[PDB]
Amino acid sequence: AMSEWSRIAVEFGEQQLNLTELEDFARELAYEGLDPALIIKKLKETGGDDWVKDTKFIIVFALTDGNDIVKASGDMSNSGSKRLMALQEKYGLVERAETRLSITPVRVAQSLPTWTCAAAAALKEYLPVGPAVMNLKVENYPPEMMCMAFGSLIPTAGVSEATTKTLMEAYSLWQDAFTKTINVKMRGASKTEVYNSFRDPLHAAVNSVFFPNDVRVKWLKAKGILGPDGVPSRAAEVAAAAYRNL
Amino acid sequence: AMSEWSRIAVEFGEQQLNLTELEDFARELAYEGLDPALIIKKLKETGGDDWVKDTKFIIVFALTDGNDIVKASGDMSNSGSKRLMALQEKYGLVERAETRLSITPVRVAQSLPTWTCAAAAALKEYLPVGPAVMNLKVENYPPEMMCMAFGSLIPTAGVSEATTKTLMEAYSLWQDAFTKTINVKMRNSFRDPLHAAVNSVFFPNDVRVKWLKAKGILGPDGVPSRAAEVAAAAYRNL
Ligand code: NA
Ligand code: NA
Ligand code: NA
Ligand code: NA
Ligand code: NA
Ligand code: NA
Numbered sequence: 001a002m003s004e005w006s007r008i009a010v011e012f013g014e015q016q017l018n019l020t021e022l023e024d025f026a027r028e029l030a031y032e033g034l035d036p037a038l039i040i041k042k043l044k045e046t047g048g049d050d051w052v053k054d055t056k057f058i059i060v061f062a063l064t065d066g067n068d069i070v071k072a073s074g075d076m077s078n079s080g081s082k083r084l085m086a087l088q089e090k091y092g093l094v095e096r097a098e099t100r101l102s103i104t105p106v107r108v109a110q111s112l113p114t115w116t117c118a119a120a121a122a123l124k125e126y127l128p129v130g131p132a133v134m135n136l137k138v139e140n141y142p143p144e145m146m147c148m149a150f151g152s153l154i155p156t157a158g159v160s161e162a163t164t165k166t167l168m169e170a171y172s173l174w175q176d177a178f179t180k181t182i183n184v185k186m187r188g189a190s191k192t193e194v195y196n197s198f199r200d201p202l203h204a205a206v207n208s209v210f211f212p213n214d215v216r217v218k219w220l221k222a223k224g225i226l227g228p229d230g231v232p233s234r235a236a237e238v239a240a241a242a243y244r245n246l
Numbered sequence: 247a248m249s250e251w252s253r254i255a256v257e258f259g260e261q262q263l264n265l266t267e268l269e270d271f272a273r274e275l276a277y278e279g280l281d282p283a284l285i286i287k288k289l290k291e292t293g294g295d296d297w298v299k300d301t302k303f304i305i306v307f308a309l310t311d312g313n314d315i316v317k318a319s320g321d322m323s324n325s326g327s328k329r330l331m332a333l334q335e336k337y338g339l340v341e342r343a344e345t346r347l348s349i350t351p352v353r354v355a356q357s358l359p360t361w362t363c364a365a366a367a368a369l370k371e372y373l374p375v376g377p378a379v380m381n382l383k384v385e386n387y388p389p390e391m392m393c394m395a396f397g398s399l400i401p402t403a404g405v406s407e408a409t410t411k412t413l414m415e416a417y418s419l420w421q422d423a424f425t426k427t428i429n430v431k432m433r434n435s436f437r438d439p440l441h442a443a444v445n446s447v448f449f450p451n452d453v454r455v456k457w458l459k460a461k462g463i464l465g466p467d468g469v470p471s472r473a474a475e476v477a478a479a480a481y482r483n484l
Contacts (some may be wrong), residue, residue, distance in 0.1 A: 037251035044254075052258075064443070068443045077446075080274030094302045114259025122263050123249040125444065126272040132402065132440040136411050181441055184434060187418075188425035213248035215256050246484045 011031055013017055030084035033204035036111030036211070038101055042106065046091050054087055055108060059116050062109035063124050063147055066182060067095045069105070106148050113152040113211055120147035121223075129178045138242045140235040145174050145225050153220060157213045159230050165230045166208065167225075169240035175202065176243070262370040276445040278346065280437060282357035283447070285349060292337060300333055301354060302365075308351035309366050309393055310375060313341040313434075315351070323334035343435060355395055355436055359449065360457050365459075377425045383419065383482045390461055391417050397438035399458065403451040405468055412470045413463070414440070415478035422481075 065072040073081040121143035134141035220226035319327035367389035380387040458464035
């Protein structure tokens with residue numbers, strides 16, 4: 001420790017820890033996930049009398065192609081690649097969020113979670129991870145669960161902890177399969193490693209207060225994913241069980 | 247609920263759907279991935295009477311070394327590096343797939359799936375991730391399954407769901423061992439009908455089922471082999 005710098009280094013480590021201070025640091029530095037209220041604002045500021053239609057179009061890009069704007073434009077129809085390149089220019093759509101408030105097509109989808117899941121269901125044959133992939137895994141996997149925005153519809157209130165956890169594990173059956181399609185590397189990962197890679201936005205979505213819990217519940221009931229008393233459907237229990245397995 | 251933006255979000259979800267509008271969007275945005283026609287089209291006119299041997303060679307390189315054309319030539323025989331480099335120049339072979347028109351050895355291999363898989367079986371001892379690997383995990387893992395091409399041959403019709411599922415499971419057992427060896431390489435595109443888009447093109451199901459029965463992976467009554475039933479077990483047992 002004789003050098004004056006190694007002396008300072010050694011000293012740095014000889015202090016007591018301000019636990020509280022380091023924990024505030026940990027909280028700031030910690031994934032919080034997207035802000036939907038400001039993604040909506042931006043879409044509505046930007047699109048005006050054309051924002052609902054532009055958004056629907058971006059959400060369907062989200063559902064079917066993910067965030068891969070450029071790669072996808074190179075393989076799609078000319079009229080599609082045109083709209084898409086335009087809407088990117090128009091809203092400043094990015095493939096990966098550099099900042100909070102960056103607008104990725106997935107985040108738009110998430111911010112409007114009830115629509116996106118209904119459209120996912122309505123367009124299930126166009127999903128890269130849809131009915132054909134989910135049938136390999138279980139029977140009757142609910143199509144509404146077939147997008148990146150489902151986690152924001154799972155309740156935490158008005159529903160038992162156990163329900164929330166079954167809904168999460170059932171959703172995770174899809175997340176697992178989806179993750180392996182988006183990140184081929186996860187095809188050689190353990191379940192837990194794959195689970196960690198989507199754990200953070202999953203919890204953020206479930207725990208967020210932006211989209212109100214009572215409507216998540218009413219919606220899940222309406223779709224049949226929650227029974228008349230707020231308990232997951234049998235298909236959902238079957239899917240959670242298949243996730244827990246093997 | 248509590249925020250005008252929240253209220254907007256739930257109100258957006260209460261909109262009745264316009265199926266026609268949303269399907270238009272879907273069809274026009276559908277990503278094609280691989281178009282085998284474009285690749286065979288290019289290889290053929292360009293090669294001429296010289297194309298079939300050039301394709302075979304490109305695919306043998308694809309089964310042994312994937313895309314690493316340059317890295318690969320650096321250490322292969324002079325004859326190997328010469329012929330191989332000649333073919334890159336001739337056909338425009340790239341290592342990464344940038345555009346829909348990009349020609350990689352793997353894409354060539356996947357445009358002719360039946361051949362590849364069959365070459366693969368016959369050159370199994372030269373496969374990077376082969377029997378030595380998979381005879382540890384099961385016995386008699388089908389050698390045809392041991393490559394990138396196979397996923398293109400999974401039948402989605404004319405067979406039972408139990409059969410499609412068994413083939414997907416049996417094959418995932420190889421994909422998974424193979425992806426691990428790549429996840430670790432010091433520094434790619436998998437393909438099958440179930441993950442592919444409405445836009446994509448595969449050998450028709452009946453040709454898939456026919457080839458499968460021919461190589462013995464499916465039996466003559468449509469049902470997967472023991473070696474497949476089994477090795478799908480190994481997968482299902484984690
Ligand atoms: Na690990
Ligand atoms: Na119930
Ligand atoms: Na609509
Ligand atoms: Na079409
Ligand atoms: Na290995
Ligand atoms: Na049979």
